[model samples]
Target: GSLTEDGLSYKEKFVVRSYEVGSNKTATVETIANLLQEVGCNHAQSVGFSATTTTMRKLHLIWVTARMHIEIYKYPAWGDVVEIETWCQSEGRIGTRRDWILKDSVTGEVTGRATSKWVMMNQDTRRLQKVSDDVRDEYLVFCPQEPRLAFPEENNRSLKKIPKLEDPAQYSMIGLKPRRADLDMNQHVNNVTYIGWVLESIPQEIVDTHELQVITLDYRRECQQDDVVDSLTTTTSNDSQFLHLLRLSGDGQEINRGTTLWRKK
Candidate 1:
């Protein structure tokens, strides 16, 4: 593992196990997302403080996914080992920046690159936080440099916008209830769990015909353990793109909006 520059960034290696790949025997988009998050937290842990520790203090880093841009040059196959790296950069009072780059462990060729934006929230109040003097002093970041998310301010505004489709017939999956496993230490549905729910709605027809390429999500609210949630989706006219919305049933509050891009297998 590489923890360079006074613990500013981190890197690690992982094998693409059979269970982690899709029917095509290639790494799945969801798995890559899982790895991205795993490395981010691992970096924080390396720094001696983390979202988990924040929870113990009655504060939790909501770390909302404002936007995630992943470009896959190629997908690694099962049994192939890959290297994953993550680092933090600077951002405004309301958010922070993080980036990931993946490589083939053997050949060391770049496999993919991803960038994400995050905002903090108070656990008890569930309110978003600003990077006040207190916050900046507490969560210090290193290697603050460029190569940031392209048009970050523009992406931040777009993050809250919902996917523009709404017909009951369009959805492939709905009425999903959260299980205990879905909840994190903060007692709300974890971010990756939301990603999984959307993946479940990918039509098997599409599964056999296409491969997932990218995912962009804008988290709007939290999903508590007891909430009855729904996953909404609509396939594009071209049949190569999908728009998804996840909302709570009773309150009608949206949890997140996710759009997926797929290419023919």
Candidate 2:
């Protein structure tokens, strides 16, 4: 087994197994997330469970896999050991940011890195709030530096100003409904759910024609349970398929917009 000292002042271990690799024999997103969660929980436990006990606090802290930006420069082989590291940064009114890195045990090569945003809330109230000072202080000890980013603002005004395409041939749109499962503890649709909606709006034909390589989502506002959301998509490409724009509307208001990059398979 290979191990390394995590940035959070703890020893972390990783193992590469046959089941953890994708067709390309590289770690898949789910495998990476599971490993990251293990390291995150281990460090949190050492610091009194920042992500689990304190934040969850009798509430179901379903840490849905939010946005993940992964860059895999190398692939780990089966039976190898890898070291995973993680640290929590700052807290926000609704969510917090955390950083991570993975290293190969044999070559000591840095394999991948990712940043994830997590939110805390009261399960009953379904409203998001800041973490307790006690918990925040404990988590801050491991942070390398203050988070360099902030939560994005709602894009209601910008979406409203964008002209609606009246020509049916120019664009395509789909409707989304904020359901019970979509709502986070904040009593509103989870931010990642908006991204899922945008992904779903892509037509099967387009999806079959291209492979999604990158996605950029700019969340503007929150949508609540029962809110009806409409997603508009337009494609422009012969091989370099690109989504010119993806606009989401809910309750007769624009909630967010996104752009996606696709490479033809």
Candidate 3:
């Protein structure tokens, strides 16, 4: 990966690995998520602002994602090469933002776009914290002067915010537990793992006939290894959209709320 000529964003190229594709031979959403994560991390590391950087590590601080929205116009097939461009900017005073655009390397056609919000956490206290000026300066030099968003403001506003799932969801899956492999470097269940749980309760018929076109997630709490989870889904009348929630079984603490838009296959 390398910084663009304008020095405002990072660009990386990735080949669709055989293992990254599903039965359809197209890259899966999880694979796209992983590629986005990799490019963003590489961007930060190249600019000396990553969590693993000397300053951040010394301060015992790490970046945690709070929300993510992804839109896939077309999925790349196996052997296809995809190029991603990602950039970061400030999000108010307490949080930072990142956005990405994915394109087919051969045709240069845009395939997907994503945006996410992140905040710093005190590794020891595990509490959200403001970005210190010192930390801010470290990355400010790399950000664009003006904010750029993968999705426009109007489109963002048009998307409904996911609501908490109350009792009596149409579909439910219980006894979901995080496996050791689910944890990330920060020792918490990785955000991508939650996507699987969010889709867990969806009916197989829907899965067989539909393709996910968009997904939006609001992560509220982190899940631990031993926490039992319940995945709940409420279908819409149109059958083109779904609302979902994942929560702890013990006290019904919400882990994440989500909405997905699907198109007929």
Candidate 4:
């Protein structure tokens, strides 16, 4: 069966809305991640897969984000329409490999690209589940067999340990209480929420003075109702970059780690 009414695969492009861009009139890194999530779920639906509300009810499955790598060749300013095309493939026993390419909707030059790893978890047990062969077979029909990315292998983005260990003196911290609005259908803080929280501990002055060019996140735990999560960041001793950690405020058990590279605007 085909996915689109027009007999073509799912595709969409739009102008960078004012709200989507930050103070610099360019899209924020989180905005791009949100868009990627938007398109990825939509594409899954078009192909008869379940996510958002249907996965748990229908298949006892929930998508879990494992890791992400992104490179922004250049940020697109407000009113610059851009085209984003995404596809996915199975990454052995690891997870699904989702890839996206972003281009200037006008100039047609590639502007950003990303690859994300996703795995399914048994919602009640919270244990990782191998993607079923049925799911894998269908996904293969939609994406490429090989990786196609904007940046080369040498530029592969990966997050590192924020601190050698959780020594409170090594980082700055901010606290957030996750409310209902912050939770997705899966009852955990949404993936995009983590992206924003990664910046929370960074100083307002530092954020204002620099631009985020690349970011990587690895989700290790889930934050839910009645949980206070700490957003932590420590600027690198060598460069303008910073390392981050998100942990359970009550127990200090880590929820995730984020790594960022920045440049002066």
Candidate 5:
């Protein structure tokens, strides 16, 4: 499915595949992250607004996610069909925002909500670019006429920014490397792969008994192939919230920072 009946948004249905689930028989956080990315791209592609389009391809522009927030109310199980709806809105002068709502296709119960900010990058220069009027018109016709958000202002308290790690991290995992398979269409490690690396440095005891409820990721720089990385985490005394960082190995350049909130399973 492309645009929903409203024509103001895009809708798609996804079946939770066996490989996408974890030991709990529910979709893993990585799987959810991948699905969100997929639906966003599909929406843009369908509207001729994606880099894959000839017009954008010639412009040498690609969209890069800058930040993301997710709240998962429930996880879909294997063989469940998830109905996902996504919409795009302009953000500031140069940035764009996308939001998503995921539901159980059969029962119509919502499974999750997510919002992300993206910026166009010059493929050759690797620098962010402003959305030129020529490019904006291509998708403006399809985007929401009025701004809207999945996590609106009233409900945005939960979408707080991931705290910056000031003091030395209590835990760190070194020598992380992105495999070739982790690279996506843009030839950089995909955003979803960063979620795995972030989780790697967390204490196993917490990972064993707690389930993630909320997550936020702020992308500082792209992680390219062959780049070595280190994962670091600082946990709260209560074990309910954790601050994380992923940085380059030798130069110590920041790649991404994230925070995760968990509840006992």
Candidate 6:
């Protein structure tokens, strides 16, 4: 969507563009996050609201889940077309979920995919509630898939165990508390915000020591607006360095888990 001097224009829009940085290249997490924001905004804009987290919250029928995980598969080289497709799905009662599949326009291959859940909340009481009849009806009309279990238990169990370290020299970790600003339409911490936390928690040395090649993530649970999340990271050297795990903790629950792979620069 673009604005014109004479009037608003509806030109074809893309969330992100590819970039080059020598033989091996990578996309910044910020780029992906911006794209996601654009997709979310575009959807909200179509519904007559500015695409903002606050506006989404006002809708009072979506809870932003804490378990937002991203996995970057193929890096977009400079001048490549990056297309992002996003949609929402749900089971009957647990909550509504959103997902994205990024693709390379030339190759028709998926570069990445991410999924997360959301809960509806009442604006007056700031309490969780069911989706409004209007919102649920709209979603059903837009996305007709029957509710499937979010992150099937079988796939979640596929995650590898965090490796134990003796000296544990090359790793670092941090924890963050959800702020009021972090809450979206659902009065829960927005799912996309967790990606920012994950990126911020990576060790500085690891950034200097290796070329981060890929990241895979899974959102295991939802975090409330004021919850504190703990992040635990471990890095190991075996031809390349890798962030073995990311755990988001709060309310005696593990909110999310993830891994990042880095090749020696």
For each candidate in the order shown, give its overall lDDT on alpha carbons.
0.73, 0.56, 0.86, 0.73, 0.84, 0.55
What lDDT tens digits, residue by residue, belong to model 2 across residues 1-265? 2223545444476777889875656554446656775776687667655455554665554333323444444556666787876666664444566666678987887876656656665555656556666556545666656443222236411122223323342345566676776664657665556666766657776666654554544444456675666666666453443343334453346565555556665
Clashes of each: 1, 4, 0, 0, 0, 5
Model 4 spans > 4 angstroms off: 1-10, 51-59, 132-134, 149-155, 158-165, 169-171, 237-239
How does model 5 fare in lDDT?
0.84
Model 4: worst 10 consecutive residues (lDDT sum)? 1-10
Worst 10 residues of 1 by lDDT: 150-159
Tens digit of per-residue lDDT, candidate 4, span 136-162: 664566665666544446735543343
RMSD of each: 3.4, 7.6, 2.0, 3.5, 2.1, 7.5
Candidate 5 lDDT at 221 equals 94
Residue-wise C-alpha lDDT for candidate 1, range 1-265, written one tens digit per residue: 6687656678988888888898778888777878888888788778776543344355444566666666676788998988988887657686777888899999989888887777776656777777665555555545445554432464442344545557663755767888887776657677778888877777788878877666777777777777877777888643377788877777668777778888875
Candidate number with greatest lDDT: 3
TM for every model, in the order presented, reads: 0.84, 0.54, 0.92, 0.85, 0.92, 0.59
Clashing pairs in 3: none
What does the lDDT read for residue 169 in candidate 6? Answer: 25
Q: Write the per-residue lDDT of candidate 5 for residues 191-246, one digit (tens) a residue.
A: 89899999989888877788888888999998879899999998764338888999
Model 6 lDDT tens row, 84-140: 766566545556766666788878787766555566665456567665554565455
- From the highest TM-score down, the ranking of the candidates is 3, 5, 4, 1, 6, 2
Candidate 4 similarity to native, TM-score: 0.85
Better model by TM-score, 5 or 6?
5
Candidate 5, pairs of clashing residues: none
lDDT of 6 at 113: 62
Pairs clashing in candidate 4?
Answer: none
How does candidate 3 fare on TM-score? 0.92
Give candidate 3 regions above 4 Å deviation. Answer: 52-58, 157-160, 237-239
